[PDB]
Write a protein that binds this ligand. Structure first.
Ligand SMILES: N[C@@H](Cn1oc(=O)[nH]c1=O)C(=O)O
Lengths: 41, 80, 96, 185, 96, 49, 48
């Protein structure tokens, strides 16, 4: 019967920030390799 | 990151300035949207990942704000 | 009286010696044991038992599982893995 | 003008070096207090050494933070410190090429792409930087919840030098957009 | 007891002198004989000499030890302060 | 439903900024509290004294 | 009246009617079609 009013901690949505930054560096990877190919062609 | 992506890639004219990129990311986060559209593929990635960020957080916010006011009606204010 | 050694009762298979509450009644030191003692066959042969005043079973006691730290990918807990796959499979097709 | 924008961009990077390395060396990230049954002990920790005040004087008994945790969270914590050391050193790669940005420095010609790769690195610094601040606060929170007994902190309150650690990641970006502004103009 | 026989992530034992340990040694059920073999095979100290010692062994293990004991032994620990442990599954066997 | 027009002024985008965060709270406040009535119901007594 | 009638009420009452009975009769009914009755809990008693 003793249930609590608990806010979400950062651990609950923790991986969403991880796949945010992983999605950021992937776009950093693509923004490099799209300018390099047009500079070759 | 989105401001850095628009300048580096060739994809002209660039509607993603440091005043504009802070505006496009806000409308995505408040789920309203904005007028400009990222056109480079690396620009569409940085839009799409921020999109999946704001759909988890707000839905976590709305579920947890339902989670308080569900408990607040099951208090059983002891009567006898 | 407290059992002097403190054990419920056992025999070493090597030395064939009962110790604990069992070894006290077999050797004649104590007179009776009204205690949590199981009626087993190796106890039935050495001492006599009445009808059970209580019946029971062997359970397993663990620490009550508190909520863990949620995992790295614990955000996608409310939907099945099969759903997210079928979304992305359908996300391709509606685009095509 | 265009030399004036490069002057602030390096000086904000030097703030980001000073604010991060302060955080990495100071053991005052987490201002907490612990008690023995009515005596209370203030303490403070970081990633390396948890230094606890003792009564009867100054105290400052310093205990290692890495082995303090349980094992799997420690395994995350092995990756967090490496993530922060790589943030500091790739900040050092950042402003050093911003020292080549200067007009009295190496060259004007092919100086634009020198300004290009460095600001890439400052983004790649703080992205690994913010995650390093992420992985500590998650793991430290577990140690507050599940850690070895005779010490349980009442307040997990984040103190000074860790707000400065957020100010470091803050000033990583304002310096990086201005050299992006210096790249486009 | 099946999943404890499938996985040794959490160690499990009994009391070092008692009919419950004696029951597992004389067991011919394919699960329980496997359960008896692991108790003696790898030993940092598996068995305990006191029930309350094993109760202290479980609660301070952070869920890494499970103490096998009797049913009416186990309901009294669950309705005691600090009510930190619980029964799992059900009774393994009939005893008296 | 974010409309097709978009503000092109800094003080305007402060207005367009703070009005957005007003809505994301209130509508999520509305969905939250309407979950409270359908899940946990209290049939209130018409009289109490 | 008999066990075969009492277990049949469980098939028709849609989970509103529990029929207490012995364990070894409870296991054999579980292993026969429609396999739509489930033992819950452990033994309340021990008999022979
Ligand atoms: N009491 C039982 C044996 N036993 O009791 C425990 O608490 N553990 C255990 O193995 C007996 O031998 O009769």
């Amino acid at each position: 019967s003793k249930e609590k009013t608990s806010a979400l901690s950062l651990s609950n949505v923790a991986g969403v920030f991880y796949i945010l930054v992983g999605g950021l560096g992937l776009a950093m990877l693509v923004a490099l390799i799209e300018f390099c190919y047009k500079s070759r062609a | 990151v989105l401001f850095l992506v628009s300048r580096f890639s060739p994809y002209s004219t660039n509607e993603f300035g440091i005043f504009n990129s802070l505006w496009f990311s806000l409308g995505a986060f408040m789920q309203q949207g904005c007028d400009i559209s990222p056109r480079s593929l690396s620009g569409r990635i940085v839009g799409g990942v921020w999109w999946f960020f704001t759909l988890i957080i707000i839905s976590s916010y709305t579920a947890n704000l339902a989670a308080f006011l569900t408990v607040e009606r099951m208090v059983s204010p002891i009567e006898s | 009286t407290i059992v002097g050694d403190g054990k419920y009762g056992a025999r070493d298979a090597d030395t064939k010696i009962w110790n604990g509450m069992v070894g006290e009644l077999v050797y004649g030191k104590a007179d009776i044991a009204i205690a949590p003692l199981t009626i087993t066959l190796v106890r039935e042969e050495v001492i006599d038992f009445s009808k059970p005043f209580m019946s029971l079973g062997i359970s397993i006691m663990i620490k009550k599982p508190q909520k863990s730290k949620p995992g790295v990918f614990s955000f996608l807990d409310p939907l099945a893995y099969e759903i997210w796959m079928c979304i992305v499979f359908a996300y391709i097709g509606v685009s095509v | 003008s265009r030399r004036g924008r490069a002057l602030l961009a390096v000086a904000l990077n030097l703030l980001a070096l000073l604010f991060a390395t302060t955080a990495f060396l100071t053991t005052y990230w987490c201002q907490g207090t612990q008690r023995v049954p009515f005596q209370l002990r203030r303490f403070h920790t970081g990633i390396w050494y948890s230094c606890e005040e003792e009564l009867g004087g100054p105290g400052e008994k310093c205990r290692s933070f890495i082995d303090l945790a349980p094992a799997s969270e420690k395994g995350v914590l092995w990756l967090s410190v490496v993530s922060e050391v790589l943030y500091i050193l790739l900040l050092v790669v950042g402003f050093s090429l911003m020292c080549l940005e200067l007009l009295h420095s190496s060259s004007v010609i092919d100086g634009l792409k020198l300004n290009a790769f460095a600001a890439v690195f400052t983004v790649l610094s703080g992205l690994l930087g913010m995650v390093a601040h992420m992985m500590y606060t998650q793991v430290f929170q577990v140690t507050v919840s599940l850690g070895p007994e005779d010490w349980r902190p009442h307040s997990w309150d984040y103190g000074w030098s860790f707000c400065l650690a957020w100010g470091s990641f803050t000033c990583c970006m304002a310096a990086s957009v201005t050299t992006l502004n210096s790249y486009t103009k | 007891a099946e999943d404890l026989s499938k996985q040794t992530e959490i160690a499990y034992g009994t009391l070092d002198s008692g009919s419950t340990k004696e029951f597992f040694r004389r067991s011919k059920i394919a699960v329980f004989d496997k359960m008896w073999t692991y108790m003696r095979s790898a030993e940092p100290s598996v068995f305990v000499r006191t029930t309350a010692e094993g109760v202290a062994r479980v609660r301070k293990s952070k869920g890494k030890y499970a103490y096998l004991l009797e049913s009416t032994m186990n309901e009294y620990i669950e309705q005691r302060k600090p009510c930190d442990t619980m029964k799992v599954g059900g009774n393994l066997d009939s005893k008296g």
